[PDB]
Amino acid sequence: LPPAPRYFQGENTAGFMRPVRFEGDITNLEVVGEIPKSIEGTFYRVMPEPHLPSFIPNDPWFNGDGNISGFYFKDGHVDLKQRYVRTEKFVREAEARRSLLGKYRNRYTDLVEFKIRSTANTNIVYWRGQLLALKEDSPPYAMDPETLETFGVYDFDGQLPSLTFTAHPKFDPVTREMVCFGYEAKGDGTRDICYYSFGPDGKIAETVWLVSPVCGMIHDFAVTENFVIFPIIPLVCDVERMKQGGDHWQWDYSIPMYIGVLPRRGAQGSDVKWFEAPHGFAGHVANAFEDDKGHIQLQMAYAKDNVFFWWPDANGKGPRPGEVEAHFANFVLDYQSDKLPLAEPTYLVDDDMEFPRIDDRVATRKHKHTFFCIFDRKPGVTDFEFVMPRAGGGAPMSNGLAHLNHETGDIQRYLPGPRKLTGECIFIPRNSEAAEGDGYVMVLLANYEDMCSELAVLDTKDLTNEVALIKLPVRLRPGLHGNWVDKSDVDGHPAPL
């Protein structure tokens, strides 16, 4: 077999990116300042964190085993629980005590035959009393919210129609539906998209099979009252390339950024319209909604080149690390229009940004607050001379959060400091009567001075000030998505405004 290294090597596992691989508990975390005593609930986040050194050199960050952190808050106290998702990969590799799964999304490079290849490492959401650990090439893994025990692969009581489940389902706050899809829904390289939804009782509602113009990556999507919207990243899959040991994904400079629009209820596959936005990278969706005219306002991060630069075009052409910026874009779509080309979007702010969150009490409806990561290259904001030698590689960098008020246009920026970087934030309603966007924001910080992680708690009345800073004595490796589950919400999701 390819040799199994016994320690981690390469930039993607150096410095702050070095795997820790701890599972267990740290109760009664140290706190500087004061956690608001009324906060009650749990912040769950997931990080890729290889349990064993890969036999693939420079294995991408996205291919690491999913490790779940839960921060449990009550009466101004907080405990951490941490546990790996027991994926097929995790379990079989743990049994063998070596890596067996090969290249990202390429089963032809695996050392054994896997049924499920999930690392369950991208998102962790709450649904009907369980956590669902998500990875877009796979079904979810169900987990216990209290103990973080893995129950196993989840198929929604045998109803799951797709081989794949998006890392970005949307929760309709009015209908209490979970709205979902999967791409490559019938296997490697397929252009099949399965759009599907579940009512709050757990029964499947929608199931519509449609066909993508290309086999492209659909990482995120958007949902409005009457439509679902599928933006396609111009990364394209050719299974024949994969069979020869090549990459699942390859950039295509010759195609637009497709944006499919399908009626949300009662549609057939042929009802989808594939609009054509200017060539670019579809980043994360903040939210979409229908305005007065019934036009879709789609607000999302959008770049003009390949953010995933390690998967270049057929001739190896693409950007370098740190070159591509994404901007907060507004696209306008009209399902009734027969004109497929779309205009350039308008931009809501000028910041290099990503990882937008809204108050999910208005998800699928008009929102007027967005919170998001920023990367500000303004001199002094990050001490690069200090940070970069300690940082390792393979993950995006965020050196602040921003809050945009969409009515006033006001922006507040949280800067944790010159030797700290941030993950994706969560928003917590102050209480069940709170106005949209009024409450608390939490975000995990990487502190390169201490080589420790911290959890910051902010009040939305002044995002520039930490009300509390929770000081972890270990590193939590840079991670992906996370979610707040409030104790006052019976189904784990906040009530509509």
Ligand X SMILES: Oc1cc(O)cc(/C=C/c2ccc(O)c(O)c2)c1
Residue 121 touches which of a copy of itself, ligand X, none (Cβ within 5-8 Å per kind)? ligand X
Q: Shortest approach of ligand X to residue 202 CB, angstroms?
A: 26
CB nearer to a copy of itself: pick between 77 and 487 = 77
Site for ligand X contains 420 (CB under 6 A)? no
Residue 136 one-letter amino acid: E
Q: Answer yes or no: are the C-beta atoms of 141 and 118 closer than 8 Å.
A: yes
CB nearer to a copy of itself: pick between 35 and 286 = 35
Residue 396 touches which of a copy of itself, ligand X, none (Cβ within 5-8 Å per kind)? ligand X
Q: Which of 99, 121, 162, 382 binds ligand X (CB under 6 A)?
A: 121
Residue 248 touches which of ligand X, a copy of itself, none (Cβ within 5-8 Å per kind)? none
Residue 378 touches which of ligand X, a copy of itself, none (Cβ within 5-8 Å per kind)? none
Residue 219 touches which of ligand X, a copy of itself, none (Cβ within 5-8 Å per kind)? ligand X
Q: Between β-strands 346-347 and 216-217, what pairing exists: parallel, antiparallel or unpaired?
A: unpaired
Count Cβ atoms within 10 A of the Cβ of residue 153 and give its class: 0-12 exposed, 13-18 middle, 19 or more buried: middle
Q: Shortest approach of ligand X to residue 291 CB, angstroms?
A: 25
Task: Kindly give, in sequence order, each residue whose CB lies less than 8 Å from that of residue 177, ignoring residues fewer than 6 positions away.
Answer: 171, 197, 198, 199, 200, 205
- SS3 at position 241: helix
According to DSSP, residue 490 is labeled T
Residue 20 touches which of a copy of itself, ligand X, none (Cβ within 5-8 Å per kind)? a copy of itself
CA distance 25 to 114: 31
Q: Shortest approach of ligand X to residue 130 CB, angstroms?
A: 21
Q: Shortest approach of a copy of itself to residue 74 CB, angstroms?
A: 10
DSSP string across 271-336: G-EEEEEPS-EEEEEEEEEE-TTS-EEEEEEEESS-SSTTS-BTTS--PPTT---EEEEEEEE-TT
Site for ligand X contains 284 (CB under 6 A)? yes
Q: Answer yes or no: are the C-beta atoms of 28 and 50 closer than 8 Å.
A: no
- SS3 at position 85: coil
Q: Shortest approach of ligand X to residue 138 CB, angstroms?
A: 9
Q: Which residues bind a copy of itself (CB under 8 A)?
A: 6-8, 18-28, 30-32, 51-53, 77, 82, 94, 97, 451, 471, 473-475
Site for ligand X in 303-362 (CB under 6 A): 307, 354
Site for ligand X contains 49 (CB under 6 A)? no
428-448 CB burial, b ≥16 within 10 A, e <16: bbbeeebebbbbbbbbbbbbb
Site for ligand X contains 62 (CB under 6 A)? yes
Q: Shortest approach of a copy of itself to residue 8 CB, angstroms?
A: 7
CA distance 56 to 238: 20
Site for ligand X contains 184 (CB under 6 A)? no
Site for ligand X contains 219 (CB under 6 A)? yes
Q: Between β-strands 273-277 and 281-290, what pairing exists: parallel, antiparallel or unpaired?
A: unpaired
Q: Which residues bind ligand X (CB under 6 A)?
A: 62, 121-122, 135-136, 219, 283-284, 307, 354, 396, 480
